[PDB]
Design a protein around this ligand. Structure first.
Ligand SMILES: Nc1ncnc2c1ncn2[C@@H]1O[C@H](COP(=O)(O)OP(=O)(O)OP(=O)(O)O)[C@@H](O)[C@H]1O
Ligand SMILES: Nc1ncnc2c1ncn2[C@@H]1O[C@H](COP(=O)(O)OP(=O)(O)O)[C@@H](O)[C@H]1O
Lengths: 17, 511
């Protein structure tokens, strides 16, 4: 391996109106 | 005491299960009123190793049933590894954490949460510490052991390791208390196999489907080596044939039929054909005396206590069927274990891939009692070329230490090389390591040649009178595989020109 993957992700907003 | 094997589940390993019962698990069945004084902490972990198909995973669940956990969660090591570092250690933490909840909640009177690893041996390779070459997976083992023996230790657990690579395991992983105790399982003896057949048969025995002409006492021993895992598939085939019998439309042995189908862990009978196309045609005294010598020194191993290991190589000129002779030497004595190691299957591999394919075969062979292994075309896997000296140093080194390495006490084997040129080997010091040698002279004479051709029977009395006329005198030096080659090459001809085509080609052989 010798593997470094550091990642991010995004949000799906809920409908509260 | 609930540890008797008259209970159906598993069998054949009775001594080994007895040992783990003796010293590993005695603390857990005892009146606690006594042990609470002694403060004896139970074994947290156990290891058991052996070949794959020898019935260990029915040992583990069966000991959990013996001393009840809530339940086992069984896992395989490679089933968890992730490229992303966090996931693997997280998985292991989840596995252990199932127990820690009950332990802290209910104190020290909790029942065991039991863990099983199918193979650790990939994840638990022995790390080593220096700036380079720390390792790829060297930080999962840390998380594992930190759960096992770590801070805020827990007594609520039991963990069984299973592996086929007991030597790669880290030395601290199995130090006492983290996994204290080790057991070996080995492929069962005839007693164990008659037990196993009793087990897998016991339903058919109760339902009386198979009533006749079936004996397990003999049917266990007619196969000298099989795996307990394989035997249930065998029994399934014996049950499957009675249902494939009613394709035509109360039970029979089909074992004698299907054992030829079954590839064993051990000996195989279907790899001969390629090496033996035509069988063994004895053209003269050298053939029979050679394989007589093979049959001679096979008895050496089986009747010697001071030479577990022995080795020979068949040298000779090329195209003399030395491979076939080794195969016949193997087949003559009905060994438990015979296996080929050859470049045919190791083709297109690196110098450290063929070594690790070859060592697999040998450490596989070590754990059978009696065995014969054969290596063909030594030069090929050795990757020799005359123009330049070129070869893989690794392979010959790893080959000859295996020729000088004795197996564990009470197990014995012979090794058979087929090398076709030994001058290289004499200069390169593999020939002192081989015990002794066999010259395989190719046929030297016509009076033997026409005899051989009579045994084959391609040519008529007139075509053979031709040969008897043409050469009595020459000593022909010819490899027999080439003989087959060019008789087949002349077999396609105008029939009138057939014979002297064969003769003219034969007179191009040199020497
Ligand atoms: N007693 C015998 N004498 C000679 N040839 C035999 C004998 N028994 C079997 N054979 C034949 O030997 C042939 C096997 O080919 P062979 O092993 O000679 O090729 P090879 O020697 O591996 O090639 P190389 O010479 O490159 O190693 C088969 O055709 C087989 O029938
Ligand atoms: N008494 C016995 N001894 C050995 N093997 C047995 C016995 N009874 C059943 N078996 C077979 O042993 C096999 C063990 O297979 P498994 O544990 O899944 O693979 P591995 O043994 O490689 O972990 C089972 O498939 C089972 O059919």
């Amino acid at each position: 391996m010798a593997e470094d993957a550091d990642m991010r992700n995004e949000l799906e907003e809920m409908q509260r109106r | 005491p609930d540890w008797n094997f008259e209970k159906m589940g598993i069998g054949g390993l009775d001594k080994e299960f007895s040992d783990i019962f003796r010293r590993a698990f005695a603390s857990r069945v005892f009146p606690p009123e006594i042990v609470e004084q002694m403060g004896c902490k139970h074994v947290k972990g156990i290891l058991l190793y052996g070949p794959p198909g020898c019935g260990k995973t029915l040992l583990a669940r069966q000991i959990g049933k013996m001393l009840n956990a809530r339940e086992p969660k069984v896992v395989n090591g490679p089933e968890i590894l992730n490229k992303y570092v966090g996931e693997s250690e997280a998985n292991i933490r989840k596995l252990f954490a199932d127990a820690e909840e009950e332990q802290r909640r209910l104190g020290a009177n909790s029942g065991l949460h039991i863990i099983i690893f199918d193979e650790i041996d990939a994840i638990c390779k022995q790390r080593g510490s220096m700036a380079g070459s720390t390792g790829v997976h060297d930080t999962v083992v840390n998380q594992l052991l930190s759960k096992i023996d770590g801070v805020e230790q827990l007594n609520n657990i039991l963990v069984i390791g299973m592996t086929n690579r007991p030597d790669l395991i880290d030395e601290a992983l199995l130090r006492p208390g983290r996994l204290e105790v080790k057991m070996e399982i080995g492929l069962p003896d005839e007693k164990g196999r008659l037990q196993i057949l009793h087990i897998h048969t016991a339903r058919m025995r109760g339902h009386q489907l198979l009533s006749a002409d079936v004996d397990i006492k003999e049917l266990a021993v007619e196969t000298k080596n099989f795996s307990g895992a394989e035997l249930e598939g065998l029994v399934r085939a014996a049950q499957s044939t009675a249902m494939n019998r009613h394709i035509i439309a109360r039970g029979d042995f089909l074992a004698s039929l299907e054992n030829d189908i079954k590839p064993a862990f051990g000996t195989n009978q279907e790899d001969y054909a390629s090496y033996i196309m035509n069988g063994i045609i004895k053209w003269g005294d050298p053939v029979t005396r050679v394989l007589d010598d093979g049959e001679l020194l096979v008895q050496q191993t089986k009747n010697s206590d001071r030479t577990p290991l022995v080795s020979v190589l068949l040298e000779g000129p090329p195209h003399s069927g030395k491979t076939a002779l080794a195969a016949k030497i193997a087949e003559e004595s009905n060994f438990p274990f015979i296996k080929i190691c050859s470049p045919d299957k190791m083709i297109g591999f690196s110098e450290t891939a063929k070594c690790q394919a070859m060592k697999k075969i040998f450490d596989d062979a070590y754990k059978s009692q009696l065995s014969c292994v054969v290596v063909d075309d030594i030069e090929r896997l050795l990757d020799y070329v005359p123009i330049g000296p070129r070869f893989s140093n690794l392979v010959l080194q790893a080959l000859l230490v295996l020729l000088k390495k004795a197996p564990p006490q009470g197990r014995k084997l012979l090794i058979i090389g087929t090398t076709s040129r030994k001058d290289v080997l004499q200069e390169m010091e593999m020939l002192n390591a081989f015990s002794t040698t066999i010259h395989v002279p190719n046929i030297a004479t016509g009076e033997q040649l026409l005899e051989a051709l009579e045994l084959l029977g391609n040519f008529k009395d007139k075509e053979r009178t031709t040969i008897a006329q043409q050469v009595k005198g020459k000593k022909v030096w010819i490899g027999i595989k080439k003989l087959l080659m060019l008789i087949e090459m002349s077999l396609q001809m105008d029939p009138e020109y057939r014979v002297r085509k064969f003769l003219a080609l034969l007179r191009e052989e040199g020497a």
